[PDB]
Ligand binder design. Structure first.
Ligand SMILES: NCCCS(=O)(=O)O
Length: 658
């Protein structure tokens, strides 16, 4: 239905625009919708886009405002001192600033619903908050409202929260429009979603994107589908995949590459308040940090990820235990049975559960899905679900039976509580995935598994060699296969770091010459070089010209297929910031053929230096465009946890970058 007010092309240049006479006497009833299309590519630190206020002496705290911050945060205030109400609702990382050098038109829809007593904010087609209150306050029923303002809030006659930006369209309605109606408002988004809340994964959150271009032209993506908010393991996390057959324009409904079922796939709104935001699913098994590669010989797609048994993450993983027993140079998965104090069992060939104390097989076998069988019969456990109904996190049996898995909390036989690496493969380029297999230990019986570097593995162009980077304390540990991922060996490369999250990604500069770029603890991205297809590695150097935080962020990297300025080119994707995970860039490097040094010549700013940018994935699309799927928020910040739909995809051309 019709707007009660519609206006457009307002410039906000640190000077508010009064629209009181046009708008105020049109406001009626207690439910309102505001639709606003606006740009702000050089915002002030904190600025209001729209205000309704009592501008009179003594009523400073009687106003409604829609505001934003230069962090990309959006929100509203709804205040009335006489009613003793001061509502503030917001969500960080909700905005775009610029795309390809041009200011992005954001589409904001705020719904104020008196019947449901609920305030709801959408930006660019994404619901960023929905808040129900006991005492509802209609936005134009604030005591003494006498001003409607764009680009500030009028308090006691003065301009507060002055904005820099533009409002190209603003409309208001004397109605709380439905979610359906909202879905019909046209958008001008510079991005698309591949994985999103409410899709087939039923995870409300995602982290750790990957992208890889397959030989058929299909582009494949993997990701952590994270259920218990955005926390790393321990949690419930599955690995999901989606592909595009039209150069990234459209993407398939996701399927799982790796999943556990000890806990239900629940789409949950994780609390963001300071008291509860660190609530963590503590009894679920999970997968985390995936990586993809394609094998020329078999044609298979290979996907690796870390695996965590129930309640396990990096923080509490048994270090100094691989979880395997070594026997005659062969490694067998250890198991502990209900009631025992030690691990007295192993998993041998054909999944036979073997008793180590009495050196004989049992009537138990482990199938191909790491599920427990007794006499060929499937054992089961009861599934858990989570809720916050009690006012805090509970994990409780839900009445459903699922196959009993050795990675589960309720299992008869349980693996060592430490981290593993698993592998799965697809024979149809991402349409389905095999049951996962555990990789063996590479650094000994009594060393925990290395940590997979999320992103792409490396398929050497002139041989059948496949390489996956991993890391542990003191080194990068490259996993190398020459037989389609059937057998792996390691190649250790010392780095001058203890306890670094040394997430590494590789590019082949030329045949047999690999440069690996990796995260460090120094505030600088490091690199090392191999010239024998990964057998040996150079000492470590650093890139100047890009800054990271002390704790660092994953960097993604590819070798571009086409020459640029007549030179071989590498493209890096990373935040460029010493302060947080923000200031996303693609950095184009040109290779110097005389020494393989790289001149970082072009820096492309993905969005504003202050807008969030964290883990990232890049790939050269079949049409030579660049696809970027990235965390568009600060995934380190304790203030930006548990945000929906912030992993986003964009398409760029090389000319945009240069
Ligand atoms: N991938 C393991 C480290 C994730 S994070 O650096 O804490 O965001």
């Amino acid at each position: 239905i019709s707007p009660i007010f519609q206006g457009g092309s307002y410039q906000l240049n640190n000077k508010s625009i009064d629209i009181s006479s046009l708008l105020l006497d049109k406001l009626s009833g207690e439910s309102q919708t505001v639709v606003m299309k606006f740009k702000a590519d050089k915002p002030n630190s904190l600025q209001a886009l729209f205000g309704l206020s009592n501008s009179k002496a003594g009523f400073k705290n009687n106003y409604f405002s829609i505001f934003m911050r230069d962090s990309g945060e959006i929100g509203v205030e709804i205040r009335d001192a006489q009613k003793g109400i001061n509502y503030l609702f917001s969500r960080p990382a909700s905005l775009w600033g610029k795309h390809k050098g041009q200011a992005v038109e954001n589409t904001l829809v705020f719904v104020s619903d008196s019947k449901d007593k609920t305030y709801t904010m959408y930006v660019n087609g994404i619901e960023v908050f929905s808040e129900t209150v006991d005492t509802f306050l209609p936005i134009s029923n604030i005591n003494g409202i006498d001003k409607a303002t764009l680009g500030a809030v009028n308090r006691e006659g003065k301009e507060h929260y002055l904005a820099k930006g533009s409002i190209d369209e603003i409309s208001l309605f004397n109605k709380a429009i439905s979610d359906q109606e909202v879905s019909t408002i046209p958008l001008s988004n510079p991005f698309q979603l591949i994985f999103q809340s409410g899709d087939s994964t039923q995870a409300n959150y995602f982290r750790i994107p990957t992208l890889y271009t397959l030989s058929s032209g299909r582009v494949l993506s993997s990701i952590d589908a994270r259920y218990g908010g955005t926390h790393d393991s321990k949690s419930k996390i599955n690995i999901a995949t989606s592909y595009s057959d039209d150069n990234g324009k459209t993407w398939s409904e996701p399927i799982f590459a790796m999943k556990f079922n000890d806990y239900e796939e629940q789409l949950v709104y994780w609390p963001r308040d300071n008291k509860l935001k660190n609530s963590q699913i503590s009894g679920s098994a999970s997968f985390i940090d995936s990586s993809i590669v394609e094998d020329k010989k078999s044609g298979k797609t290979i996907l690796l990820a870390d695996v965590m048994p129930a309640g396990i993450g990096n923080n509490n993983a048994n270090k100094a235990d691989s979880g395997f027993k070594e026997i005659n140079g062969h490694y067998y998965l250890k198991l502990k049975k209900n009631g025992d104090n030690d691990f007295r069992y192993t998993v041998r060939e054909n999944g036979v559960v073997y008793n180590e104390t009495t050196n004989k097989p049992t009537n138990y076998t482990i199938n191909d899905k790491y599920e427990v069988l007794e006499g060929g019969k499937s054992l089961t456990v009861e599934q858990y679900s989570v809720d916050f109904d009690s006012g805090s996190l509970r994990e409780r049996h839900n009445g459903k039976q699922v196959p009993m898995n050795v990675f589960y909390k309720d299992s008869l036989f349980k693996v060592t509580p430490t981290n593993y690496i698993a592998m799965t493969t697809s024979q149809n380029r991402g349409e389905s995935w095999e049951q996962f297999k555990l990789l063996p230990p590479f650094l000994g019986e009594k060393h925990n598994g290395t940590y997979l570097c999320p992103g792409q593995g490396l398929a050497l162009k002139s041989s059948n060699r496949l390489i996956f980077a991993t890391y542990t304390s003191g080194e990068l540990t490259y996993l190398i296969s020459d037989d389609s991922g059937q057998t792996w060996k390691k190649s250790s490369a010392s780095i001058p770091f203890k306890n670094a999250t040394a997430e590494a990604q590789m590019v082949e500069l030329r045949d047999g010459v690999i440069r690996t770029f990796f995260r460090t603890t120094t505030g600088k991205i490091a690199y090392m070089t191999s010239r024998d297809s990964g057998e040996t590695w150079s000492k470590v150097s650093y890139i100047d010209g890009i800054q990271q935080t002390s704790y660092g962020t994953q960097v993604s990297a590819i070798k571009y297929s086409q020459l640029i300025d007549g030179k071989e080119a590498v493209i890096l994707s990373t935040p460029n910031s010493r302060s947080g995970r923000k200031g996303g860039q693609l950095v184009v490097g040109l290779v110097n053929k005389e020494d393989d040094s790289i001149d970082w010549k072009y820096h492309y700013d993905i969005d504003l230096p202050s807008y969030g940018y964290a883990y990232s994935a890049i790939t050269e699309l079949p049409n030579h465009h660049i696809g970027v799927l990235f965390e568009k928020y600060d995934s380190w910040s304790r203030n930006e946890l548990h945000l929906s739909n912030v992993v986003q995809y964009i398409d760029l051309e090389i000319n945009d970058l240069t």
